[PDB]
Structure to design on (1344 residues):
């Protein structure tokens, strides 16, 4: 669902399974807790952006069926989510280093300007610097290095 | 600090930083170092058995080195200065910071 | 100038890697392979079928 | 069988989203999406669905 | 030429401070770096040499370049000014290796934070989403143990815009205009300033028990202290369960602490579980002192 | 389709030159090829005379003019080459007869 | 850390055990004579079986093929021009070209075309 | 069987703590195990889970760290120790010093860090010493005179 | 031996793993006699190793990896303290099992040719142990029953620790460092050091020292830590080859010694063969010795 850029459908899909598990009468309470905990924990591991993480966190902590679980399970889930967090943050910062490596992988002048115009590289770096994904000192140096290398 | 400005900072970006609620402090030892005062100033004389020029009878230099310094800082000399220049392009010398001695 | 040889160096990198990687393959292994090559002679025989079977321009050839 | 096929399809599709940061096509896309979707707080959005929770079908039938 | 340049290139360090362009030095060859310099990485020696280089240049402004040498006999490091044509000047300085190693270790300790590692973290706040949180403390409690009690305090108290985390001075309470991050910062400050100092002193009495029993007691003590500002309310019943008369346990239901939390809420069941387990532990070990 | 047609005409020009086809056979082929593209363009859009279709027609015109120009020069080169070869062949026989 | 190599160690345990089993399997063997014939025969059958078993998306391929052909054609034609200074053909041809074209400042022509470049068809109609 | 697992997520997915504790304590109650051999068993698992949880966070610093300084600043180890740990990791990934060293050098070069390239070069030029002992003149010869290098 | 070691590791008992390691490292001695340079050669130049050594190397690697998998580095280093130098060098250099024999063969005849530099008379600074190495996981003894019996230093508190435990840990680290320095000096003087450097030498020394450590129980919290001296044969002096009995037997002597001299922080043990005597003495930092001393005959100890 989220591959198409629609988070609401993903939330609806998660709720559909949670509510389908909740109302079944052929399983015991401990199995209901086990399945719900496993699915909720697994859901965080598949988020591909920091906005989806926040949306899912907001949805989960407001669901009534999650408020009545034992304390030792709520604490475990809360501790587990915070680990996939800061990791989905580190990846978004390493992405810029990967992009810079790809840019630097070219060795001839004509194709460099044909593929990576300077006015777009500068904008891409400065937009990330603005959003506090990179510190100013590691963005200005990156711009300067490319500016010197091209000359 | 002054030695961590070279870190990339790709873990815990600036978006996710906060001040800690307690003050840290490193674990260094309380030691200084101080220059000694009673050590002698040892130097060896290697000009006694050779012809040499004494100035103001310390710093030790050579004749072809001293002469150039005189011409450069010699704006108050009769235009002698050309002779000094010609000689400078042609021993041991001792003064009892070279640019200020002259 | 160092920057003139960048393309040559990039092309030369690939030669070294597969030179070492081909050697590693042989150490990890053989009779069955030899048989296949002998069967390949059939393709030469199959290609041997075709092989075994084997107004100014006209005036110029005649003149020659 | 279908699960394996779906995994393969998603793996093959992720390759373009990987290069989205420098591919030119992903500038026409993600512009068309915004033009066809005339300060969104994601946390607020999730709570609305959570509060309704598991009574969704019941409250609309 | 390439061989010599590669040999020389490994021993070059670019000291930073003193002027523009800094300064350039070539370290001498040593048997093993760990005995003299105290580390095998040049990035620490470059930072450590700054004070010595700055002092040396301050004493002798006329010096243009600096050379470094090592005297093994007296375990000494020597600086000297140099002239062109491989000639040497008259300026000289001396520094023992012990204080240099001490300074290097001091810089490394500051870099690594005494070896305890980083302490940055995150929190899940209902509605507001993720926020930053620092788990540092002045008592030495490891990160994942500090994060244990806060995840229960948050799961019990909750969060609302008009009440925040329900902290009950001006800098410890939420104002109408505060953002959730500011409220979380005040909550952490209030914790560190008014909870741990009253809970830590009472942990010296429970070192006979296994580790996980102490860990369980820690959460209960923190929870009680947060809601009552006094850790003596529940330690009394803990002592009664461990050594006192077990028949007095059921009288806990008459205390205000129980009444405020509800007669059948999860909070009270969690409290009774600990006391029910302590009695079993006491029974299984008749020799407990 | 436009890009394919543009290259097809130029590629066919030399193929026709090498076979010694007369200009009429090239002109009829050019007209027949243009007619198919023009008819096909009637469904792939209204062909309403606006700026984009005007530019399309402008490109189509030069796509024909260039090949029509090149066809003449190719034959012009070929004729001179053949004339030189024939003149050399004519000179060989004179020496043969002189020796005989 | 010591606990982040546990998975690698666990996966690497299985490599050593197999390496020991092969030694014993080969040492327990003159059955090699019988063993070889099986592969020697199966290879031929396997080889025989293998021998027995032995819009826009079209316009794009046509464009690619024709582009390759055009590049090839421009090659093998540039070569004759390369010899212009020596051949005397491309001299006898240049004579005719000049003689027929007589029936300049290059920069002037470019400006003249550019001044009305993007409106030729509009002006013509 | 419980201790046979080595990763954190599957451990909690398969063996929840609240069930392990109950299983051990029920057996202790029925006098199948003495208290001292049940409490120690519970404590060992309780400590091991925290140890693995800590190690999982330290792995990320090595995985994503861009230089030695910020890798050390995360795990808290000294620079000399993280250098050796990285050496071991990339030697395990590459199956030897040459393969691991080449990849480490490539990473350092592409990331624009001299420190990582230095440690890679150390391995690369430590492996090369094996070439000094070969007797080039007495290598076995092919039927056509071509030597047979190992 | 491999199966016995696996049983000991999975059952969380050090005693069984010790006897398994004894067999495992007793078998390995067969590798010292092979003439690597004169092995028969294949038509393509590949040597022809006997099947007896392949199944020994493949089991040594499996045992080492199994020991490391459980998080028990103490008994993994203890295993490498009896194998020949080339085998120790090969194992620690992670390599595919198919090439371990070739690596060992090359290393053996590289050593035989004198391509390794001699070690100095003083142990390198890089061989010492520091806090960074403690954080790295050394002193981890793996699974166990008591909390005091899964850390080689014998400290109990593992969740909440006071400064008193920190002082004891600091003293015990220096004690272990002094023991390692003495072992290295003794080995160097006899001219029996192995052909290793850096981390390999550190692991060798740690494994040598690890076998002689005993954690006496009584006297205070955290008990006490002692390193037994080397003896010709244990059965004549101590009366038994198992440390679990000596640990219980030393309790009275250690308690009395600590009662007589409260100011003593650490205790050292030594053996005097001439008079068949055991000696206790207090020790200070910097390898300096105190004035307190005690003497006990061996007969009553046995």
């Amino acid at each position: 669902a989220q591959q198409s850029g629609d988070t609401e459908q993903a939330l609806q899909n998660v709720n559909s399974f949670i509510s389908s598990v909740t109302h079944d009468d052929s399983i015991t309470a401990e199995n209901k807790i086990k399945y719900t905990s496993q699915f909720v924990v697994n859901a965080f591991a598949n988020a591909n952006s920091t906005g989806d993480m926040q949306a899912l966190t907001g949805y989960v902590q407001s669901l009534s069926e999650f408020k009545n679980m034992p304390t030792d399970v709520q604490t475990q889930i809360m501790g587990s989510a915070q680990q996939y967090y800061q990791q989905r943050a580190s990846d978004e910062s390493v992405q810029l280093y990967e992009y810079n490596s790809r840019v630097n992988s070219v060795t001839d002048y004509k194709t460099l300007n044909e593929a990576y115009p300077m006015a777009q590289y500068i904008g891409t770096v400065m937009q990330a610097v603005q959003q506090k994904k990179l510190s100013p000192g590691t963005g200005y140096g990156m711009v300067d290095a490319e500016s010197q290398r091209r000359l | 600090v002054n030695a961590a400005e070279d870190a990339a900072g790709t873990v815990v970006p600036p978006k996710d930083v906060t001040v800690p609620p307690v003050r840290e402090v490193p674990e260094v030892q309380p030691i200084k170092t101080v220059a000694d005062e009673d050590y002698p100033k040892i130097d060896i004389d290697t000009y006694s058995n050779k012809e040499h020029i004494e100035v103001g009878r310390s710093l030790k230099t050579t004749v072809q080195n001293a002469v150039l310094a005189v011409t450069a800082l010699g704006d108050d000399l009769p235009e002698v200065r050309a002779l000094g220049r010609a000689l400078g392009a042609s021993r041991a010398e001792i003064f009892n910071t070279l640019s200020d001695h002259v | 100038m160092i920057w003139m040889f960048a393309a040559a160096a990039a092309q030369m990198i690939q030669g070294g890697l597969q030179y070492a990687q081909d050697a590693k393959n042989q150490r990890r292994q053989k009779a069955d392979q030899k048989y296949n090559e002998a069967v390949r002679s059939a393709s030469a025989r199959q290609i041997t079928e075709i092989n075994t079977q084997r107004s100014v321009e006209q005036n110029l050839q005649e003149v020659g | 069988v279908q699960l394996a096929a779906a995994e393969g399809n998603l793996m093959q599709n992720a390759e373009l989203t990987e290069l989205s940061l420098d591919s030119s096509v992903m500038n026409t896309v993600d512009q068309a999406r915004n033009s066809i979707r005339e300060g969104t707080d994601w946390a607020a959005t999730g709570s609305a669905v959570g509060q309704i929770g598991t009574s969704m079908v019941a409250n609309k039938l | 030429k390439s061989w010599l340049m590669g040999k020389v290139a490994s021993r070059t360090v670019r000291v930073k401070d003193g002027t523009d362009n800094g300064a350039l030095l070539v370290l001498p060859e040593v048997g093993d770096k760990q005995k003299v310099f105290g580390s095998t990485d040049n990035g620490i020696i470059e930072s450590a040499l700054t004070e010595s280089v700055t002092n040396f240049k301050k004493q002798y402004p006329q010096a243009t370049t600096v050379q470094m040498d090592y005297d093994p006999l007296t375990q000494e490091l020597i600086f000297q000014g140099v002239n062109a044509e491989n000639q040497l000047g008259t300026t000289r300085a001396s520094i023992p290796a012990a204080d240099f190693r001490n300074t290097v270790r001091g810089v490394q300790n500051t870099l690594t934070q005494n070896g305890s590692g980083t302490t940055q973290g995150n929190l899940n706040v209902p509605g507001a989403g993720f926020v930053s949180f620092n788990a540092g403390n002045s008592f030495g409690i490891q990160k994942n143990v500090v994060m244990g009690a806060v995840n229960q305090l948050v799961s019990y108290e909750g969060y609302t815009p008009s009440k925040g985390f329900s902290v009950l001075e001006d800098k410890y309470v939420k104002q109408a205009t505060d953002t959730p991050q500011v409220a979380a910062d005040k909550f952490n400050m209030y914790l560190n300033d008014k909870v741990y100092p009253l809970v830590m002193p009472k942990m010296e009495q429970y070192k006979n028990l296994p580790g996980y029993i102490q860990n369980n007691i820690y959460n209960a003590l923190v929870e009680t202290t947060y809601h009552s500002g006094n850790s003596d309310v529940f330690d009394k019943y803990i002592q009664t369960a461990l050594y006192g008369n077990v028949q007095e346990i059921p009288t806990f239901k008459d205390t205000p602490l129980f009444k405020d939390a509800g007669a059948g809420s999860r909070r009270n069941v969690d409290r009774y579980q600990l006391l029910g387990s302590l009695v079993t532990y006491r029974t299984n070990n008749p020799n407990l002192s | 389709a436009l890009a394919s047609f543009q290259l097809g005409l130029q590629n066919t020009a030399q193929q026709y030159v090498n076979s010694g086809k007369t200009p009429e056979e090239f002109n009829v082929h050019v007209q027949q090829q243009t007619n198919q593209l023009l008819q096909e363009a009637g469904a792939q859009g209204l062909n309403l005379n606006d700026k984009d279709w005007q530019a399309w027609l402008g490109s189509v015109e030069h796509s024909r003019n260039t090949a029509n120009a090149s066809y003449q020069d190719l034959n012009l080169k070929r004729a001179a080459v053949l004339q030189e070869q024939s003149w050399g062949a004519r000179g060989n026989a004179a020496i043969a007869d002189f020796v005989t | 850390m010591i606990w982040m190599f546990a998975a690698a160690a666990a996966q690497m345990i299985q490599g050593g055990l197999q390496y020991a089993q092969d030694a014993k399997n080969q040492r327990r063997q003159a059955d090699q004579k019988y063993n070889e014939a099986v592969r020697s025969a199966s290879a031929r059958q396997i080889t025989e079986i293998n021998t027995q078993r032995s819009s826009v998306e079209q316009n794009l391929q046509e464009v690619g093929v024709q582009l390759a052909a055009a590049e090839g054609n421009l090659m093998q034609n540039a070569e004759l021009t390369e010899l212009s200074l020596d051949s005397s053909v491309m001299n006898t041809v240049d004579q005719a070209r000049n003689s027929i074209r007589e029936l300049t400042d290059w920069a002037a022509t470019g400006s003249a075309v550019g001044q009305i470049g993007t409106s030729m068809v509009a002006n013509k109609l | 069987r419980v201790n046979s697992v080595t990763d954190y997520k599957t451990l909690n997915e398969a063996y929840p703590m609240a069930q392990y504790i109950g299983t051990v304590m029920q057996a202790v109650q029925q006098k199948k195990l003495s208290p001292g051999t049940g409490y120690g068993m519970v404590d060992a698992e309780s400590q091991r889970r925290l140890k693995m949880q800590k190690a999982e966070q330290g792995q990320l610093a090595y995985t994503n760290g861009v230089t030695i300084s910020d890798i050390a600043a995360g795990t808290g180890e000294s620079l000399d120790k993280v250098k050796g740990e990285l050496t071991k990791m990339y030697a395990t990934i590459g199956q030897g010093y040459s393969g691991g060293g080449l990849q480490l050098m490539q990473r350092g070069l592409k990331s624009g860090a001299q420190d990582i390239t230095g440690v890679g070069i150390e391995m690369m030029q430590q492996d090369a010493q094996s070439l000094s002992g070969i007797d080039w003149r007495n290598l076995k010869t092919d039927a056509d005179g071509k030597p047979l290098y190992p | 031996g491999l199966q016995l070691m696996q049983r000991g590791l999975k059952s969380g008992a050090q005693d069984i793993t010790g006897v398994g390691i004894e067999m495992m490292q007793q078998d390995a001695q067969s590798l010292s006699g092979i003439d690597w340079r004169n092995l028969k050669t294949d038509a393509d130049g590949k040597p022809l190793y006997p099947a007896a050594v392949v199944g020994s190397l493949g089991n040594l690697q499996a045992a080492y990896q199994s020991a490391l998998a459980a998080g028990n580095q103490v008994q993994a280093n203890q295993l490498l303290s009896g194998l020949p130098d080339p085998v120790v060098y090969g194992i620690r250099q992670n390599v595919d099992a198919r090439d371990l024999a070739d690596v060992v063969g090359k290393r053996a005849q590289d050593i035989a040719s004198g391509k390794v530099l001699a070690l100095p008379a003083n142990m390198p600074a890089d061989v010492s142990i520091t806090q960074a190495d403690v954080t790295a996981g050394i002193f981890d003894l793996g699974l166990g029953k008591d909390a005091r019996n899964r850390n080689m230093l014998g400290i109990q508190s593992w969740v909440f620790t006071s400064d008193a435990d920190e002082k004891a840990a600091q003293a015990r680290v220096s004690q272990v460092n002094s023991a390692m320095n003495n072992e290295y000096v003794y080995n160097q003087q006899r001219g029996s050091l192995p052909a290793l450097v850096g981390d390999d030498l550190k692991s060798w020394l740690m494994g040598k020292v690890a076998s002689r450590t005993v954690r006496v129980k009584d006297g205070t919290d955290n008990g006490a830590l002692l390193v037994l001296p080397e003896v010709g044969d244990k059965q004549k002096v101590f009366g038994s080859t198992d440390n679990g009995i000596i640990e219980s037997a030393l309790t009275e002597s250690v308690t009395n010694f600590k009662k007589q001299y409260p100011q003593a922080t650490t205790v050292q043990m030594d053996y005097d063969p001439l008079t068949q005597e055991l000696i206790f003495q207090g020790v200070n930092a910097e390898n300096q010795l105190g004035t307190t001393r005690a003497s006990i005959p061996a007969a009553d100890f046995r």
